Amino acid sequence: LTGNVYIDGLWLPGHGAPFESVQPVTGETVWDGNAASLEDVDAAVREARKAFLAWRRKSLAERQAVIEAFGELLEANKEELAHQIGLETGKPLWESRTEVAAMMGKIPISVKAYNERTGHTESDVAGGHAVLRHRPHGVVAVFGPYNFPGHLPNGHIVPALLAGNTVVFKPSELTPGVAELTVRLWEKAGLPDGVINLVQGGSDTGKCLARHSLIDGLFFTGSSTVGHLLHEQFGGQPEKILALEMGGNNPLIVQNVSDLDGAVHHALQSAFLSAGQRCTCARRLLVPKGKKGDEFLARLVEVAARITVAEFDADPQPFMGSVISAEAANQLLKAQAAMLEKGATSLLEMKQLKPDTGLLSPGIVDATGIELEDQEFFGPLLTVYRYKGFDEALELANNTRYGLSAGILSDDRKLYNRLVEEVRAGIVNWNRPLTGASSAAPFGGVGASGNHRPSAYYAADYCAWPMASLEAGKSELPDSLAPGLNF
Amino acid sequence: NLTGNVYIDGLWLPGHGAPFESVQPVTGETVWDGNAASLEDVDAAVREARKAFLAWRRKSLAERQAVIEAFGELLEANKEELAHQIGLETGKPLWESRTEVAAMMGKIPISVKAYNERTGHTESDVAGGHAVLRHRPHGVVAVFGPYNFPGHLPNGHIVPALLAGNTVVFKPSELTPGVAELTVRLWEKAGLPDGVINLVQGGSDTGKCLARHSLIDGLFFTGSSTVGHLLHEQFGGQPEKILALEMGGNNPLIVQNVSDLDGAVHHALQSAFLSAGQRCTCARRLLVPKGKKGDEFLARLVEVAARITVAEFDADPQPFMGSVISAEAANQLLKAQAAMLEKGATSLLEMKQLKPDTGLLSPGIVDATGIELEDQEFFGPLLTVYRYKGFDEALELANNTRYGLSAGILSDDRKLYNRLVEEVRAGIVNWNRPLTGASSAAPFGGVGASGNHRPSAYYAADYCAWPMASLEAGKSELPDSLAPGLNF
Numbered sequence A: 001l002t003g004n005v006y007i008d009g010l011w012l013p014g015h016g017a018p019f020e021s022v023q024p025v026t027g028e029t030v031w032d033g034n035a036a037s038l039e040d041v042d043a044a045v046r047e048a049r050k051a052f053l054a055w056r057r058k059s060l061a062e063r064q065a066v067i068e069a070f071g072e073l074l075e076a077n078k079e080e081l082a083h084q085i086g087l088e089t090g091k092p093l094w095e096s097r098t099e100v101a102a103m104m105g106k107i108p109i110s111v112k113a114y115n116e117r118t119g120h121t122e123s124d125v126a127g128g129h130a131v132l133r134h135r136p137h138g139v140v141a142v143f144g145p146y147n148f149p150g151h152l153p154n155g156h157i158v159p160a161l162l163a164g165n166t167v168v169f170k171p172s173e174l175t176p177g178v179a180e181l182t183v184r185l186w187e188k189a190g191l192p193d194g195v196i197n198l199v200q201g202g203s204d205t206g207k208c209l210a211r212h213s214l215i216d217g218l219f220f221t222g223s224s225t226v227g228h229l230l231h232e233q234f235g236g237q238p239e240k241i242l243a244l245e246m247g248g249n250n251p252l253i254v255q256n257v258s259d260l261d262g263a264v265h266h267a268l269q270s271a272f273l274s275a276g277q278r279c280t281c282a283r284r285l286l287v288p289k290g291k292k293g294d295e296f297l298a299r300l301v302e303v304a305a306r307i308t309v310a311e312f313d314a315d316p317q318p319f320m321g322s323v324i325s326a327e328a329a330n331q332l333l334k335a336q337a338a339m340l341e342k343g344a345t346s347l348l349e350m351k352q353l354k355p356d357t358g359l360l361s362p363g364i365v366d367a368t369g370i371e372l373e374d375q376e377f378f379g380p381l382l383t384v385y386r387y388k389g390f391d392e393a394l395e396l397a398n399n400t401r402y403g404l405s406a407g408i409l410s411d412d413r414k415l416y417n418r419l420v421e422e423v424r425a426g427i428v429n430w431n432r433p434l435t436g437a438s439s440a441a442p443f444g445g446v447g448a449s450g451n452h453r454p455s456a457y458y459a460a461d462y463c464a465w466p467m468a469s470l471e472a473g474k475s476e477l478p479d480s481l482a483p484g485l486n487f
Numbered sequence B: 001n002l003t004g005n006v007y008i009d010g011l012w013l014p015g016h017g018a019p020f021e022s023v024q025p026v027t028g029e030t031v032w033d034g035n036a037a038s039l040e041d042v043d044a045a046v047r048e049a050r051k052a053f054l055a056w057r058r059k060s061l062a063e064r065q066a067v068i069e070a071f072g073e074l075l076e077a078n079k080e081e082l083a084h085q086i087g088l089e090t091g092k093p094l095w096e097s098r099t100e101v102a103a104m105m106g107k108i109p110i111s112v113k114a115y116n117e118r119t120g121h122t123e124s125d126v127a128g129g130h131a132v133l134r135h136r137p138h139g140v141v142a143v144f145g146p147y148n149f150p151g152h153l154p155n156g157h158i159v160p161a162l163l164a165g166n167t168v169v170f171k172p173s174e175l176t177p178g179v180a181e182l183t184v185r186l187w188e189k190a191g192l193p194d195g196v197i198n199l200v201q202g203g204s205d206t207g208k209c210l211a212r213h214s215l216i217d218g219l220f221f222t223g224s225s226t227v228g229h230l231l232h233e234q235f236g237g238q239p240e241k242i243l244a245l246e247m248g249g250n251n252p253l254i255v256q257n258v259s260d261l262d263g264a265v266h267h268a269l270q271s272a273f274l275s276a277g278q279r280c281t282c283a284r285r286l287l288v289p290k291g292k293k294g295d296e297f298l299a300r301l302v303e304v305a306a307r308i309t310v311a312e313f314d315a316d317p318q319p320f321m322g323s324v325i326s327a328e329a330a331n332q333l334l335k336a337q338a339a340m341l342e343k344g345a346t347s348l349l350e351m352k353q354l355k356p357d358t359g360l361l362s363p364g365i366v367d368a369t370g371i372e373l374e375d376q377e378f379f380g381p382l383l384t385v386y387r388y389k390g391f392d393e394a395l396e397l398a399n400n401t402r403y404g405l406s407a408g409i410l411s412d413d414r415k416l417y418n419r420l421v422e423e424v425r426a427g428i429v430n431w432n433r434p435l436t437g438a439s440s441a442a443p444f445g446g447v448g449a450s451g452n453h454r455p456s457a458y459y460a461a462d463y464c465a466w467p468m469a470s471l472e473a474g475k476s477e478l479p480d481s482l483a484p485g486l487n488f
């Protein structure tokens, strides 16, 4: 809890301008420090590069041993890291602890992924003895988002380090504290100097890191806009591997359910968990027009209006917490303002619960005939579209250039089978919340949600490249020579 | 038997662009004439492939696989005629053209294995419910073919892409249009539905229209690193389209400490001059220890290289290698070795044009041990030698390049191979096998300027289908332990 950059094993003040992290409800300072400057960033990359030569030489078992020791340290400090997450984002403690448990779960599954997707295998083949192993890239810049400031950055860092890369970690300027605490745990774990490097800052720092000509890869979790800027910057430099994990405009269908509340639970989870700041949150809810659908929205609006929202450490825990800042909440109110002026109708009003905070109540708007923008965003603002044929549900589900999550709640397995056959989305759930995903499977969207470098289970794929060998044992003439070969 | 016609949505039709021909690199006679696909020919191929995708993605894997295997049976039934068209139009001797066709066939069973392992279907019970993983095709993929292996390399994209449920608009090299037309005809006799594959012949105008068309979902490219980088920059800002680049290299072969001289000279000759040095993985730089034991190697290596035979693809006894792809290419290869000598290098074996306006080149070996030459990929039988002192000096020379496709070592000493493997930044790395040796049962991709981390062969599946992961329950119903703040 010092505010220092971390480079080649040493905590030092950054040379850039000071900034602070403020608690989204109380507005008080939770973290202050200096942004890393151009030459700090250059120093982190240059040192990460140096450490790479030795860190890649460790066995897989040596690198893994440090990573699980980091996992044991996560366990030993679970509550303190959960408390930092809650402080700096607004996420309630009950749910912050969930992020830390996932950071720990990331470790054994990454180890499994590495051996299966980028492991070591051997065969006797036509051209000789065949050997396949995978190699790290070098220095990878990791950019963290603010919604999951431990789990998501960790979802890059663990597979990247496990494979023999070194990391320059640039967290969001909204969650530097959680990151600094995480890197301190990597240190307590015994990670060698330079193998991980923390460079705090905002937009200047990230640009300096993104453009540094000596990073070998860049792993990004964050907004689709900035990720597209990154992809265009890297255009013409295929030598650097780029992994982009972006947002979505995720639809949830609800048609033909026999358990009213059970569906209203999964529907509420999908849209409002983490105050609607999970990348896979349902933003468009597709409900059948008329009789068979109207009751669902009523029980859903009833139960959604009883959602509790308070400080991350409320005396009894709330379901969800504040949005990231009082500003963010501000445009969320402008967002739903724009919608109604556009012709949509309010089912449940999103309200700012405390004067200058990010504490927002759930909001539900019906835009069934209204044309709204195709825009990713974080916040508890759910839009409903009513439809007639289930073929109309499919058409609306795909009415977006995003492609992250999609889902259906229904008793009828075949309505789910049709969605799976038709929807262009990376995660697609049946009778589970959209926000539920399995780190034991790939986690990536298509369309505007990725660049075909899915993460979680497939992170192994972008953390190490393949090297294939044909071995003989001694160069010697073959039994049948080729014509023209005269010895 | 060959018309020159574009193939779109099941119909062979004349192209609307300008006429061109494909000429025999030795004989100079016309081997293929036709019209380039025009802007609107290309647009029609893409729109139709897009239309066909909707149904082709709905066929089962077993149905798609059945057609692809029928294609393989047809490759076998027509082995010799496809070998003859490859050899006629590239110059490659029949004996090795037959080898390319065998590789087209081997591509099929190995692609099926790859698909089920890398982009298949699996299921689990996990914390969040019942877990199911599937993979989906991208849509319409443009395939750009090279001229060196005009069947095997294009086939390495097309079989995995078709198998996964994609449709293809195939733009072959303007130097090998015949081979592509004959291949696409075999796809037709195989029963591929209308529009699932589309042939669009042409040169650079045709290729630009396809590469730049806003309705392709993917582009799979094998060819020069320069054009592959232009493509990557073209796609900059369009992460929605998957781009797969298989490019050239500046590949080093190290030979140190071999007890079987000829055995080592054989693998070194294969590495540098097989296919007249037009294989992507050919050795371009030969790194030999300075002094006694290496001088003998270079001496024996020069002797045997000078008795390599080079002739027409159909010579009465087969030559070891044939013509390079064209007289222009041969022209630029001769200018390359001239520049080397003018730079201070010394000629060990002169590459010579065997017949005035052809691509017939004799093997060439140049020693640039103290000279600084450019870091450049190229196809042609021109090998540069560097002499070195410590094996660490070999390592520094091998990695002295922005490419990263192949690297290898001939040696008795396994630990010299182990150091190479630990240090070299290259996609394929062989020990005591020619550099030109690769296994379709393993990934095939270079790093550095030789790829964009979408290796092909076994891993082609990875860019041919995207993952869709599901958590299933069967009925939405409240959990045993609720979360706080949800009042019922």
Ligand SMILES: [Cl-]
Binding pocket: A133
């Ligand atoms: Cl190894």
